[PDB]
N, CA, C and O atoms as a DFTB+ gen file, in Angstrom:
140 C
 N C O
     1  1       1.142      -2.149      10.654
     2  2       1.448      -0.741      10.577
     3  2       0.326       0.137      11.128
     4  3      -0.881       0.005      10.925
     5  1       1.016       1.154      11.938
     6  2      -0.425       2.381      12.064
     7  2      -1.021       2.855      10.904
     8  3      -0.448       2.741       9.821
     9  1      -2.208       3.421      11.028
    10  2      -2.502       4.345       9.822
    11  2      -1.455       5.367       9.530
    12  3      -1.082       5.249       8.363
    13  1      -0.810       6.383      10.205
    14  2       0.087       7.183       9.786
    15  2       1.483       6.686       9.110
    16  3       2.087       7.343       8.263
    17  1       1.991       5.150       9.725
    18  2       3.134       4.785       8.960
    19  2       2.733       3.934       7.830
    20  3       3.559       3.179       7.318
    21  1       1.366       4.013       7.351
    22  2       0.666       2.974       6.020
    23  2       0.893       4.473       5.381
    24  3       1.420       4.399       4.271
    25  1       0.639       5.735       5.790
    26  2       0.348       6.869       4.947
    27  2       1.947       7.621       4.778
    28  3       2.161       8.581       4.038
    29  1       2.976       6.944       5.636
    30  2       4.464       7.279       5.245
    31  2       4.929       6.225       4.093
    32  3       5.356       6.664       3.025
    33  1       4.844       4.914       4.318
    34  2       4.960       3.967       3.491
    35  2       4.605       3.988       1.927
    36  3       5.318       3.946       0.924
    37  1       3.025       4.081       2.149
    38  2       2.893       4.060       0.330
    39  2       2.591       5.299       0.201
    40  3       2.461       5.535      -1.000
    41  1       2.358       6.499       1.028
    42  2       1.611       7.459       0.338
    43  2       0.719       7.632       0.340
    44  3       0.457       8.657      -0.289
    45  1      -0.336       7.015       0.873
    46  2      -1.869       7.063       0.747
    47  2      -2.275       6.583       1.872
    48  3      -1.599       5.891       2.633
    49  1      -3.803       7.057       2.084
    50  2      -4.016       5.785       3.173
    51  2      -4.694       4.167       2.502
    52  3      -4.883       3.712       1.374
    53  1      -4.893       3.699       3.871
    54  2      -5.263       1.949       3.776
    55  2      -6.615       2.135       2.957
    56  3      -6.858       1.057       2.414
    57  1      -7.485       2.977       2.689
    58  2      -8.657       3.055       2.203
    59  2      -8.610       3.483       0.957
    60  3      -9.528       3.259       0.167
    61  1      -7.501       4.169       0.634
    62  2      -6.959       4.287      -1.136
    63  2      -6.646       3.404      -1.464
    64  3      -7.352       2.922      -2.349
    65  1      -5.136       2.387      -0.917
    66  2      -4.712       1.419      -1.327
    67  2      -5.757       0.387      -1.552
    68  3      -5.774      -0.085      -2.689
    69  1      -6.661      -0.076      -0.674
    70  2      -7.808      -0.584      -1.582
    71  2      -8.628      -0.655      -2.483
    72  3      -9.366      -1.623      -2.669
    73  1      -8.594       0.458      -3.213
    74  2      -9.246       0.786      -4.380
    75  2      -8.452       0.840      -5.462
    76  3      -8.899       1.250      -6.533
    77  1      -7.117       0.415      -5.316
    78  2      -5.876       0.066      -6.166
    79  2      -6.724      -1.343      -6.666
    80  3      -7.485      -2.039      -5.994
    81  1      -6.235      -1.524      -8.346
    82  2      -6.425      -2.869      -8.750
    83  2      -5.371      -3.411      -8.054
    84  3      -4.389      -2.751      -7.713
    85  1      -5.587      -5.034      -7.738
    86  2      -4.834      -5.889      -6.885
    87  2      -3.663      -5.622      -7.628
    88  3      -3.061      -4.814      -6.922
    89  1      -2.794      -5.889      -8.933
    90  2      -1.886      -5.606      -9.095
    91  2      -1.422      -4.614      -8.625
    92  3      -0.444      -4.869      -7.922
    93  1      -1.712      -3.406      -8.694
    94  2      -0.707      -2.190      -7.989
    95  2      -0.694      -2.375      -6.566
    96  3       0.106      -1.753      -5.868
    97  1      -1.337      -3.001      -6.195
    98  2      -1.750      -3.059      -4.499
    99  2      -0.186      -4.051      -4.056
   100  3       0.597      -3.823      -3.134
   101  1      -0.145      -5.026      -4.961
   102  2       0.811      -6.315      -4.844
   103  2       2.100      -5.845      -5.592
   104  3       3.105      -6.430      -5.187
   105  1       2.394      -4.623      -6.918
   106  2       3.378      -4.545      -7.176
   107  2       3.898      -3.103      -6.262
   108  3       4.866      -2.529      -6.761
   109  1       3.345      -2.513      -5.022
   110  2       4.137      -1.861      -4.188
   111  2       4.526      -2.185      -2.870
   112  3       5.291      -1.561      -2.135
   113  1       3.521      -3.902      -2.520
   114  2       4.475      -4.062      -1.214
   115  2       5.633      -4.764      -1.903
   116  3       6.703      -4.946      -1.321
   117  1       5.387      -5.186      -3.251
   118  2       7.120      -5.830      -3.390
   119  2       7.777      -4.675      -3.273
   120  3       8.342      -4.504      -2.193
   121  1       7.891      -3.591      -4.305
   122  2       8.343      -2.096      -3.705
   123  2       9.328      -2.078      -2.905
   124  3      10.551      -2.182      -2.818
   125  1       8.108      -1.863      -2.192
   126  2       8.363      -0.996      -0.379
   127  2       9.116      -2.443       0.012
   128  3      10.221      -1.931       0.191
   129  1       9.302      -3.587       0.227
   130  2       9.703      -4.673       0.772
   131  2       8.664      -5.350       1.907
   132  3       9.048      -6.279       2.619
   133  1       7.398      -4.826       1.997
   134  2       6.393      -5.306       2.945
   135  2       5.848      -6.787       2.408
   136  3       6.157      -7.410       1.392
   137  1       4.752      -7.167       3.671
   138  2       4.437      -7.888       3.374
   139  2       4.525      -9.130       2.387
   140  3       3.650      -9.995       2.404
């Protein structure tokens, strides 16, 4: 994904989503259907 469709996708950017504990990180690409 680009940065802008990581920041349509979850909402945030790739540098937030990393600072997610791994669970939330792992319970929104089930979510979203990614990865």
């Amino acid at each position: 994904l680009s940065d802008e469709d990581f920041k349509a996708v979850f909402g945030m950017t790739r540098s937030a989503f990393a600072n997610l504990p791994l669970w939330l990180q792992q319970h929104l690409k089930k979510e979203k259907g990614l990865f």
